[PDB]
Coordinates of C-alpha atoms and ligand atoms in Angstrom, one line a residue:
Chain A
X301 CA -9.3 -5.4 -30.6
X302 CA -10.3 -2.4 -29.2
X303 CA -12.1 0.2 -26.6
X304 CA -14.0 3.0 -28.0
X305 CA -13.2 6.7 -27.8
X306 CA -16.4 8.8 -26.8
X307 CA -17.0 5.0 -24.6
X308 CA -14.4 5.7 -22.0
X309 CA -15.0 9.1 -21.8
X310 CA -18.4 7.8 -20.2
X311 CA -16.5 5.5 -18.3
X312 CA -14.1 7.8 -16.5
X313 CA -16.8 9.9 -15.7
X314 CA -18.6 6.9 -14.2
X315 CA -15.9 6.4 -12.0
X316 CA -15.2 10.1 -10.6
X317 CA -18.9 10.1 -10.1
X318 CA -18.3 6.3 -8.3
X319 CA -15.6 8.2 -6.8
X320 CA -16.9 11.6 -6.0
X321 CA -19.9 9.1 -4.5
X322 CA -17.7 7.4 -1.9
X323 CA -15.9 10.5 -0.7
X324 CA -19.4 11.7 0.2
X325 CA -20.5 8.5 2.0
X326 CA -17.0 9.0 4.0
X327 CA -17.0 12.3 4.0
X328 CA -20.2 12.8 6.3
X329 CA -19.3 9.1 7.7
X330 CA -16.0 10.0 9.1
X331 CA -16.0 13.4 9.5
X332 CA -16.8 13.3 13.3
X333 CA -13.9 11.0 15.0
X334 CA -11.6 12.7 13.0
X335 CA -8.8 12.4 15.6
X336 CA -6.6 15.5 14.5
X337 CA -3.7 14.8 17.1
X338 CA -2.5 18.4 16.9
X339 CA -5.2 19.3 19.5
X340 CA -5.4 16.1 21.4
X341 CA -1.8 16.6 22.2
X342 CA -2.3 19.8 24.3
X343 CA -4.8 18.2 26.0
X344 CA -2.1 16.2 27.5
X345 CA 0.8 18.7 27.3
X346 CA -1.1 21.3 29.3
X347 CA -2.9 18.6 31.3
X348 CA 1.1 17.6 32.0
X349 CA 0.8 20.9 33.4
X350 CA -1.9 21.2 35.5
X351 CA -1.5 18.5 37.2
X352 CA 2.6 18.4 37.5
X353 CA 3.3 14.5 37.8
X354 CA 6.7 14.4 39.1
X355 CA 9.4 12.1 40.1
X356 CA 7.6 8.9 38.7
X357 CA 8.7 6.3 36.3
X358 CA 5.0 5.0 35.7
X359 CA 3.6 8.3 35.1
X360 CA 6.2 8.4 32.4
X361 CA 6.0 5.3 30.8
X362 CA 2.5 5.8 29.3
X363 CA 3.7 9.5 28.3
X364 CA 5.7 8.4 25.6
X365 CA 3.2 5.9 24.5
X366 CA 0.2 8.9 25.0
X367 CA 3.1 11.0 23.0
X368 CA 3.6 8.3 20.7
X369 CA -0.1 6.9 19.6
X370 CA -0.6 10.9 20.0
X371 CA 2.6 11.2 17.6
X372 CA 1.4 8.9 15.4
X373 CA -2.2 10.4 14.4
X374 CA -0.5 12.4 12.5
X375 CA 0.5 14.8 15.4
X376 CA 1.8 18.5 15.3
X377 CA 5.7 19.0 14.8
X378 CA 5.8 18.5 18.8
X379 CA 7.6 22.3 18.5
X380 CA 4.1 24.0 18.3
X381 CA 2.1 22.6 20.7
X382 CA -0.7 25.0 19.6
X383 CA -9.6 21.1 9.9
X384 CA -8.7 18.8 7.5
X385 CA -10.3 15.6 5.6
X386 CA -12.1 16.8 3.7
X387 CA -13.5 16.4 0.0
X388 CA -9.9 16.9 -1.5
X389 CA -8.8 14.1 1.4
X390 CA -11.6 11.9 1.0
X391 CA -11.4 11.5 -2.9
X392 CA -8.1 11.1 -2.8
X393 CA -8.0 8.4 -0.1
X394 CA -11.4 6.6 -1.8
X395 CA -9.0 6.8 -4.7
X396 CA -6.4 4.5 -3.2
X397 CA -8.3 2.3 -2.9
X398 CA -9.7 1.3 -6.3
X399 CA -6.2 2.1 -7.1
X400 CA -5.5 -0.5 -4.6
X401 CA -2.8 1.4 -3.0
X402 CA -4.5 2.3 0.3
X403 CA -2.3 4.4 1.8
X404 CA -4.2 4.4 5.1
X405 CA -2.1 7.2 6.6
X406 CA -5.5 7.8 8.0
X407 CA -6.9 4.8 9.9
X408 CA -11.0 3.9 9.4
X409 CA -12.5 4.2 13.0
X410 CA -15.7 4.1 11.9
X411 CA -17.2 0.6 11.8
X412 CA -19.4 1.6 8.4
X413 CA -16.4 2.9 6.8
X414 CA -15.4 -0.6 7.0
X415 CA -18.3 -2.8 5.9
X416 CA -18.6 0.2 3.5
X417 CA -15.3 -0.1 2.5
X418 CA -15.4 -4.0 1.9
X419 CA -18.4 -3.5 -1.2
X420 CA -16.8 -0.1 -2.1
X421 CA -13.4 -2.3 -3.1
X422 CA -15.0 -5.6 -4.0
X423 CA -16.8 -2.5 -6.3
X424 CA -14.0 0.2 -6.9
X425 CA -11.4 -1.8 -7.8
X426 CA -12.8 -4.4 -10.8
X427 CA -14.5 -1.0 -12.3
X428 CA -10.8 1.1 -12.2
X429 CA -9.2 -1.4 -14.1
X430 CA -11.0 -0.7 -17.1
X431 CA -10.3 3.4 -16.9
X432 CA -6.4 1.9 -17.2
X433 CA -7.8 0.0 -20.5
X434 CA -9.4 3.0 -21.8
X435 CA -6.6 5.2 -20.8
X436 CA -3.7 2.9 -21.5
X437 CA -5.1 2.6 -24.7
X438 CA -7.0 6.0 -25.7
X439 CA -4.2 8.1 -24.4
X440 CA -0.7 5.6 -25.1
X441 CA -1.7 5.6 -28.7
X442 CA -2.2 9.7 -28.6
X443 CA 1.6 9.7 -28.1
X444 CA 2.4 7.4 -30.3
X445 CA 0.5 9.2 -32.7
X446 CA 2.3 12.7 -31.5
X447 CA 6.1 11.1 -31.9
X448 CA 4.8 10.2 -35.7
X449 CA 6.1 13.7 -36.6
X450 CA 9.7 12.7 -35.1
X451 CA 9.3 9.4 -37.1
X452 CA 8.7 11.0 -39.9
X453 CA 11.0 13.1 -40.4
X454 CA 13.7 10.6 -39.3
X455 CA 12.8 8.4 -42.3
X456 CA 13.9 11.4 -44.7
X457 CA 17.5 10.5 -43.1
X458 CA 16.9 6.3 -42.9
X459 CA 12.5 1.9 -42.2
X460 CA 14.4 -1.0 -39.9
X461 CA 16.2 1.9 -37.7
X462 CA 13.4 4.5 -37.2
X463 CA 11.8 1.2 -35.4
X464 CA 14.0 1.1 -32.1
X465 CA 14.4 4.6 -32.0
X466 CA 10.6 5.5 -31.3
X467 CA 10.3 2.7 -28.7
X468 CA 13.5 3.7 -26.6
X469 CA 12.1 7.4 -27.0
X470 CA 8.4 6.4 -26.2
X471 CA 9.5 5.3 -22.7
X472 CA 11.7 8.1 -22.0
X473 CA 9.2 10.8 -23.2
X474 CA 7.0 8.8 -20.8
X475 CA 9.0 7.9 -18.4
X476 CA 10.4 11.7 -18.1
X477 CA 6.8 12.4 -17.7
X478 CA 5.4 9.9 -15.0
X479 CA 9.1 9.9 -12.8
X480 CA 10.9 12.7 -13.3
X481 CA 8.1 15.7 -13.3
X482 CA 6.3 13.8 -11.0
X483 CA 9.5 12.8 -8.3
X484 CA 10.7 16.4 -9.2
X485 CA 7.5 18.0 -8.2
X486 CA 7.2 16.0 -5.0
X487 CA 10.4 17.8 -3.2
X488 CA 8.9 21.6 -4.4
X489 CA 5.4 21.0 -2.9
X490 CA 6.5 18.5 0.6
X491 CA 10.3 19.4 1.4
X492 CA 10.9 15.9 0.9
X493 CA 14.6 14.9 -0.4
X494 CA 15.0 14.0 -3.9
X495 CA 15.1 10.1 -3.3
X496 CA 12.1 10.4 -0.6
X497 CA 10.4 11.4 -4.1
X498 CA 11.2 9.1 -6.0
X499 CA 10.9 6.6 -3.5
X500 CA 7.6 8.0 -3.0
X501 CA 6.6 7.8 -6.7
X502 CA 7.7 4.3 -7.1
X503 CA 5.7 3.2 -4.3
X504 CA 3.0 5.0 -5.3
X505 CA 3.0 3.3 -8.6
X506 CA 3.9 -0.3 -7.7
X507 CA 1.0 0.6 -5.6
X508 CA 2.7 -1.1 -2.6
X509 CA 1.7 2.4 -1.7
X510 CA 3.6 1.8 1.8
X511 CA 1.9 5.0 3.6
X512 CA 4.9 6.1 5.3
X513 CA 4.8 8.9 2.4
X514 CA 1.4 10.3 0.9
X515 CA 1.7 13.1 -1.7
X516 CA -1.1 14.8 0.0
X517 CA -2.1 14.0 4.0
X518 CA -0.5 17.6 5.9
X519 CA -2.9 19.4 7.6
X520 CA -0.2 22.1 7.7
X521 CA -1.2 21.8 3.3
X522 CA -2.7 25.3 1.7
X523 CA -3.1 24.3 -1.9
X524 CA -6.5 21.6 -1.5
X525 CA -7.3 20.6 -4.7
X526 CA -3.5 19.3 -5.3
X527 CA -4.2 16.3 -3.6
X528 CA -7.0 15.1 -6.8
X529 CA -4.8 16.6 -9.3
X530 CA -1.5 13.9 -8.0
X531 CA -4.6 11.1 -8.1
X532 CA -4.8 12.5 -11.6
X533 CA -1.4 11.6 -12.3
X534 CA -1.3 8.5 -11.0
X535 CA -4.1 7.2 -13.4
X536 CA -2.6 8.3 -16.3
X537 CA 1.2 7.1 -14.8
X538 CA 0.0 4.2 -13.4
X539 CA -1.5 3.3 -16.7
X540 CA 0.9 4.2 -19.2
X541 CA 3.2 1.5 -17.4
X542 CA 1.0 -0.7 -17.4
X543 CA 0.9 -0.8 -21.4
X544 CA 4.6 -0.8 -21.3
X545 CA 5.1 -3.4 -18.7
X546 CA 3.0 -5.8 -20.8
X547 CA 4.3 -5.1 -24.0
X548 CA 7.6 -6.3 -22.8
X549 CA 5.7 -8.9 -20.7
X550 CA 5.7 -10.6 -24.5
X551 CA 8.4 -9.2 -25.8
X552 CA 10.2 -11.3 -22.7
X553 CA 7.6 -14.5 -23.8
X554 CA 8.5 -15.0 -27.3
X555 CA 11.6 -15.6 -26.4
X556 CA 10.8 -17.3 -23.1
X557 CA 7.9 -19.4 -25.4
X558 CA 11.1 -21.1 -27.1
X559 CA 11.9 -23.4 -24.1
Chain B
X1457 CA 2.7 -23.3 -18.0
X1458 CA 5.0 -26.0 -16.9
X1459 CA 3.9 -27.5 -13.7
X1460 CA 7.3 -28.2 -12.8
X1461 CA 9.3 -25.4 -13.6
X1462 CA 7.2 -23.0 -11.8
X1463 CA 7.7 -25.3 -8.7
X1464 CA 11.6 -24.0 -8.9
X1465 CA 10.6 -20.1 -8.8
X1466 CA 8.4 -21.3 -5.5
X1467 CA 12.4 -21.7 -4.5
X1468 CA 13.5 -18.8 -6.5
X1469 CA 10.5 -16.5 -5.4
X1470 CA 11.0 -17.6 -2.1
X1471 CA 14.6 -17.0 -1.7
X1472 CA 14.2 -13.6 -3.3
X1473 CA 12.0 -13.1 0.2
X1474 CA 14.6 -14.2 2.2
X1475 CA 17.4 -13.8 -0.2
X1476 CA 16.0 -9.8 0.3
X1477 CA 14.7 -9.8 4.1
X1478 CA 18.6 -10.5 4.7
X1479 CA 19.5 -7.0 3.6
X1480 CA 16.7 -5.5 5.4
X1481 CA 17.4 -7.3 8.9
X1482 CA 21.1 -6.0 8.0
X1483 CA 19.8 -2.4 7.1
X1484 CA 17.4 -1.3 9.5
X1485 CA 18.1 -3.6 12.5
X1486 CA 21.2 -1.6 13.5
X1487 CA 18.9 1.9 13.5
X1488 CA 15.8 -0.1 15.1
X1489 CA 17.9 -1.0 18.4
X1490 CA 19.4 2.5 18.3
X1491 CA 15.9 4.2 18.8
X1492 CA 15.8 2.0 21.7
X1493 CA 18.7 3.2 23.4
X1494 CA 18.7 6.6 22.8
X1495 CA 15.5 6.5 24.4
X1496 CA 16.5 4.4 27.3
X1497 CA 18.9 7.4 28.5
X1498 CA 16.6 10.2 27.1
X1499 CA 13.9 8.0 29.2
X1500 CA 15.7 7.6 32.5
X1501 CA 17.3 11.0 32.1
X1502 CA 14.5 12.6 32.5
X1503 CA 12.9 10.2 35.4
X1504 CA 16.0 10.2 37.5
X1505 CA 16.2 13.8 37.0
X1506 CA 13.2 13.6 39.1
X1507 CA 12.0 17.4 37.4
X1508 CA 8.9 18.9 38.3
X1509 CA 6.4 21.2 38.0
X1510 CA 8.1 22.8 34.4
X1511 CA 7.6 23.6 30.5
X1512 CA 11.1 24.7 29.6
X1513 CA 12.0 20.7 29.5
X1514 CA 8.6 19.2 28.8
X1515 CA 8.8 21.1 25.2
X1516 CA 12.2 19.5 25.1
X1517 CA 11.3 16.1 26.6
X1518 CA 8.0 15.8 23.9
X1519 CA 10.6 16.7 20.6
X1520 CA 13.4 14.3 22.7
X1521 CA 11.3 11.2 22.5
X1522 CA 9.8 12.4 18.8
X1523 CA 13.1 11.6 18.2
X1524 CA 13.7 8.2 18.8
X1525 CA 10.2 7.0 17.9
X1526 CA 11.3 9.0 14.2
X1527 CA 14.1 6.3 13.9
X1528 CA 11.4 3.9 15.4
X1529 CA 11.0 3.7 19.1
X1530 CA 9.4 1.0 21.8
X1531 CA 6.0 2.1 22.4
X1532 CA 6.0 2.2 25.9
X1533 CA 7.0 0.2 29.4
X1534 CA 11.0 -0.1 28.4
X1535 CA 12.2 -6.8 20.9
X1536 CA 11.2 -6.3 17.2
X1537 CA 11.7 -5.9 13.1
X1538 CA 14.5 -8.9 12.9
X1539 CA 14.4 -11.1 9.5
X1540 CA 11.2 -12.8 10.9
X1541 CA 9.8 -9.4 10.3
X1542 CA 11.2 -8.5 7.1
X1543 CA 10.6 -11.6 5.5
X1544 CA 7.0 -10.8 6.0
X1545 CA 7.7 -7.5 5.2
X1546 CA 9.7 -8.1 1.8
X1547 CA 6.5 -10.3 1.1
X1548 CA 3.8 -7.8 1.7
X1549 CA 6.3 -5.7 -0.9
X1550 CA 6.0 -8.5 -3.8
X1551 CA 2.0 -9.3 -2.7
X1552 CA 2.5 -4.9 -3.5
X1553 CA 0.0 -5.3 -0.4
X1554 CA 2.6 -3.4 1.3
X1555 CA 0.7 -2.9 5.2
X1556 CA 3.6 -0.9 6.0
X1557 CA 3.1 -0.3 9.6
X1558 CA 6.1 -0.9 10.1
X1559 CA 7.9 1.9 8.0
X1560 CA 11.3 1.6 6.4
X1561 CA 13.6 4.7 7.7
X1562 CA 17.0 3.9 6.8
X1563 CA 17.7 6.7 3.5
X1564 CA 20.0 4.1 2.3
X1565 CA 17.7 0.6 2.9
X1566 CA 14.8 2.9 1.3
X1567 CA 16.4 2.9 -1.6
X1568 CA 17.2 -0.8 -1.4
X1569 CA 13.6 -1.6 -1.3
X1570 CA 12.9 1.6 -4.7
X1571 CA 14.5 -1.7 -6.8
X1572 CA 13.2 -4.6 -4.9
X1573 CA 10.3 -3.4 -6.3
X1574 CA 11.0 -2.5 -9.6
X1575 CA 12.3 -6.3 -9.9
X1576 CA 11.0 -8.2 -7.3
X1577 CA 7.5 -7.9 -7.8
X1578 CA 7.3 -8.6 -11.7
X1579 CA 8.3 -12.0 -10.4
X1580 CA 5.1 -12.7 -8.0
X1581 CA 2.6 -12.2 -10.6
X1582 CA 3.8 -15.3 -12.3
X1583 CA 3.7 -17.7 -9.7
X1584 CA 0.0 -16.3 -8.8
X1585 CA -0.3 -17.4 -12.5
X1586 CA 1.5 -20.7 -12.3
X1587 CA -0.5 -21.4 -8.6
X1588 CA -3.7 -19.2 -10.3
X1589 CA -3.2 -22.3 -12.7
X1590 CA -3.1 -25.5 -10.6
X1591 CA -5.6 -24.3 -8.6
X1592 CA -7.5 -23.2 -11.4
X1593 CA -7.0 -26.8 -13.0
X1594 CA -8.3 -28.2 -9.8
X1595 CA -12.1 -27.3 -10.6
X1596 CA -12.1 -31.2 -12.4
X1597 CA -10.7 -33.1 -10.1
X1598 CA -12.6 -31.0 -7.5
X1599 CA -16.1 -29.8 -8.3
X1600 CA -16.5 -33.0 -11.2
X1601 CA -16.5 -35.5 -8.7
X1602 CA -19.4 -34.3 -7.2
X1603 CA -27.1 -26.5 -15.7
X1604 CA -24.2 -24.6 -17.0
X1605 CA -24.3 -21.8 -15.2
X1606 CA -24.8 -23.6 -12.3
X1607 CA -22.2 -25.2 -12.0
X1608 CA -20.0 -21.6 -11.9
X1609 CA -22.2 -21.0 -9.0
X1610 CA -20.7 -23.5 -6.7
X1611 CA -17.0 -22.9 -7.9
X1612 CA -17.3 -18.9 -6.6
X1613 CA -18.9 -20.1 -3.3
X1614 CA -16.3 -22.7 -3.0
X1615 CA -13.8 -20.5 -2.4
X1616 CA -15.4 -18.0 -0.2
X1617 CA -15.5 -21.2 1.8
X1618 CA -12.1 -21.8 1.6
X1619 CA -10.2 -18.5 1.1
X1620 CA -12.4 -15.8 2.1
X1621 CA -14.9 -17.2 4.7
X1622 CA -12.3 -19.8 6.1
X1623 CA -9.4 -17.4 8.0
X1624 CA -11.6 -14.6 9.1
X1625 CA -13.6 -17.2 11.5
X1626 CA -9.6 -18.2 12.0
X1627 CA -8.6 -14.8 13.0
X1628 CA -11.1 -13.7 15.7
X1629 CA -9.6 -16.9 17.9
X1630 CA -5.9 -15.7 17.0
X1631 CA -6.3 -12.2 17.8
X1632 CA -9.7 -11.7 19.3
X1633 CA -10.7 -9.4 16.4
X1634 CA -14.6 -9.1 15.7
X1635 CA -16.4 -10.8 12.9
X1636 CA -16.2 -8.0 10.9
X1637 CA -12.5 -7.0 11.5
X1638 CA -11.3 -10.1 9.6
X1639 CA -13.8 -9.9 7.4
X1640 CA -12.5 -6.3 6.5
X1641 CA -8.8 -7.4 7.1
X1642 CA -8.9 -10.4 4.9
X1643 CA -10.7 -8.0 1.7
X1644 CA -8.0 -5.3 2.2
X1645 CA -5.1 -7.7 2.2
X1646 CA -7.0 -10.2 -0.8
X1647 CA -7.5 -7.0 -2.8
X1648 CA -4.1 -5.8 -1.9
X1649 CA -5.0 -2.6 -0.5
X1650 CA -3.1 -3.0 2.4
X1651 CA -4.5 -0.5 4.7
X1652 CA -2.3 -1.5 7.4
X1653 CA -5.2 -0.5 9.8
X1654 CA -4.8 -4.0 10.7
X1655 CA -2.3 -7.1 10.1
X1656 CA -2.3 -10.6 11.5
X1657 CA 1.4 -11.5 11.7
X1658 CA 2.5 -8.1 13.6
X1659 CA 1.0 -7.8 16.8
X1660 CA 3.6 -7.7 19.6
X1661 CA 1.7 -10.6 21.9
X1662 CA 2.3 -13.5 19.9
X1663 CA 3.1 -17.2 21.2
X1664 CA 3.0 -19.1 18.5
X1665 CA 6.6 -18.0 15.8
X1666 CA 5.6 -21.0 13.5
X1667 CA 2.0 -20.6 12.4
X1668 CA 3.4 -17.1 10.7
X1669 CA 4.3 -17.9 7.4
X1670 CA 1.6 -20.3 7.0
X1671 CA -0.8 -17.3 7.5
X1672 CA 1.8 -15.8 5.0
X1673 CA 2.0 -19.0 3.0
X1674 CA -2.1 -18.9 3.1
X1675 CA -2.2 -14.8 1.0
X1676 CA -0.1 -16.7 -1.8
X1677 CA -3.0 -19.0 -2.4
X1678 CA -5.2 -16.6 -1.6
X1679 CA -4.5 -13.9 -4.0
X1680 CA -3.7 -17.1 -6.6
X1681 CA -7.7 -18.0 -6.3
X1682 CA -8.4 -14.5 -6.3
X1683 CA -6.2 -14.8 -9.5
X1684 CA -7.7 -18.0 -10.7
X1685 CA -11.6 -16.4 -10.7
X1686 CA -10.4 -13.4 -12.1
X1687 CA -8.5 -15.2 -14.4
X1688 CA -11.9 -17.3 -15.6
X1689 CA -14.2 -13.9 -14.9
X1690 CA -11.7 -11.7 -17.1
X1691 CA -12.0 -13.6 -20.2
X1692 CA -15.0 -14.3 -20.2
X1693 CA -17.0 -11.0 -19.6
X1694 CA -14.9 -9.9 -22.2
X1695 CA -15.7 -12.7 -25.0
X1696 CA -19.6 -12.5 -24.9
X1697 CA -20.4 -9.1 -24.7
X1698 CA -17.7 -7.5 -27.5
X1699 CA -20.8 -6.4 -29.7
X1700 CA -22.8 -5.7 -27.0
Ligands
K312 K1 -1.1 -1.5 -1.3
K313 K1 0.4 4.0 9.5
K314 K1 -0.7 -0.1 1.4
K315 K1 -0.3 1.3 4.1
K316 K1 -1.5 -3.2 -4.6

């Protein structure tokens, strides 16, 4: 009752090719309506301008909606008034979707993105939850392995007590891995306040993935292979829980199975 | 698998969307009519100002209205998000579908919903078990009243008939969405990626309050097939090809 090492490792690589292969069919398929609301905005600020509308309620009434669709592409900090999507974006964002997050911070325009979209997840999604076997598995037991050296060297002390030790340190040395570095990290790389992080990462990994937060979707960003690197992490975080949350899924049944 | 207990979590599970849609009517409601008034001056105060021809107050005016859409504003012209809303809401949380176009912006009823989570959705994944179950159970009393593999055939189309086909034909009448669009909206929300691209029960022009958590009602037995073929797919797959 197993998966294979070297088999994964085949797998996984299956996948970021899968993936790596649907941020090219969007990347060339999307790349051109890109709205990028930071330019279309002085388009209307100056054209505001040029034209001077004054003294009208109408005129103003679809400003705020032109300022707030405008706003809401992702617009400029509305102070400046003065590229992006690619690879980095794309990957990541075909990523939430076998993920299943989809944080769609980034709408699909383009009619092919969506009947593309429809076989890429009908596809993408089955395939991932495999790589969270392989990696659940492969890499959860790695750590179990690792802690051995704690364990054994608690048993030179005192068996029944080493037992509940390991499993309350498994999920912290886990946990402290998957929240805390992770929510941590967050505020350092998106000024966003501690909660926001932590709000963000639990979101991210219930995979509600709201959108209102998304690790990586500034164009004001520098760093552009961050963006993969988070999708990294939320593989590996999304399926270490996953191992845990079913363990206790039985844990919870064989004493649930007595009713 | 107790056909009748699970019946009391359909009350339980329920209530935990209302029992929770409560606190988000009670925690974002306040701040989602306060956008609206602060814009109302900030709206008129800058029309019955009457300015013209200038920059100095346009930067200002842009960064004024920013503002109050932030906190969640009225989109334009000068009524929304009350427990209606968040019942949906705290179901497309559970469903982890989570369409999100309307955001949650309230630091404190953020947090609120960082444990709703944590909590609420374990639960949901049982009743798509004990409704992935009785629906599963229904392929007997279904399917045998009317050679081995094809009879798995039918059971897949049966339910494109009935969960996936069925709604999207629904939804271009109800919306006026192309084929495609429900096609694509019904996949996104089934799968549970929630793109929030699109959504059926959220469009400001509705008439008809009622038919809202029966569209609602409708992704719990739709996700419970999904779960119910999945269920069937998952453990088989697995079974026959182990050495292979
Ligand atoms: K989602
Ligand atoms: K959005
Ligand atoms: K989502
Ligand atoms: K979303
Ligand atoms: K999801």
């Amino acid at each position: 009752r197993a998966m294979r090492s070297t088999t994964l490792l085949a797998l996984l690589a299956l996948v970021l090719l899968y993936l790596v292969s649907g941020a090219l069919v969007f990347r060339a398929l999307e790349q051109p309506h890109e709205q990028q609301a930071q330019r279309e905005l002085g388009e209307v600020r100056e054209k505001f301008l040029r034209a001077h509308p004054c003294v009208s309620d109408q005129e103003l009434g679809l400003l705020i909606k032109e300022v707030a669709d405008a706003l809401g592409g992702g617009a400029d900090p509305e102070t400046q008034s003065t590229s992006a999507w690619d690879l980095g974006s794309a990957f990541f964002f075909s990523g939430t979707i076998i993920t299943t997050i989809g944080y769609g911070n980034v709408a699909l325009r383009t009619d092919a993105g969506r009947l593309f979209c429809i076989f890429y997840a009908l596809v993408g999604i089955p395939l991932f939850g495999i790589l969270l076997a392989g990696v659940g598995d492969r890499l959860g037991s790695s750590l179990r392995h690792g802690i051995g050296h704690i364990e054994a060297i608690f048993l030179k002390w005192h068996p029944e007590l080493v037992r509940v030790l390991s499993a309350m340190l498994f999920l912290l040395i886990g946990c402290l891995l998957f929240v805390l570095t992770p929510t941590f990290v967050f505020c350092y790389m998106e000024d966003w306040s501690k909660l926001e992080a932590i709000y963000f990462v639990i979101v991210t990994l219930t995979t509600v993935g709201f959108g209102d937060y998304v690790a990586g979707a500034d164009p004001r960003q520098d760093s552009p292979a961050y963006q993969p690197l988070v999708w990294f992490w939320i593989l590996l975080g999304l399926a270490y829980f996953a191992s845990v949350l079913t363990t206790i899924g039985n844990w919870l049944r064989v004493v649930s199975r007595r009713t």
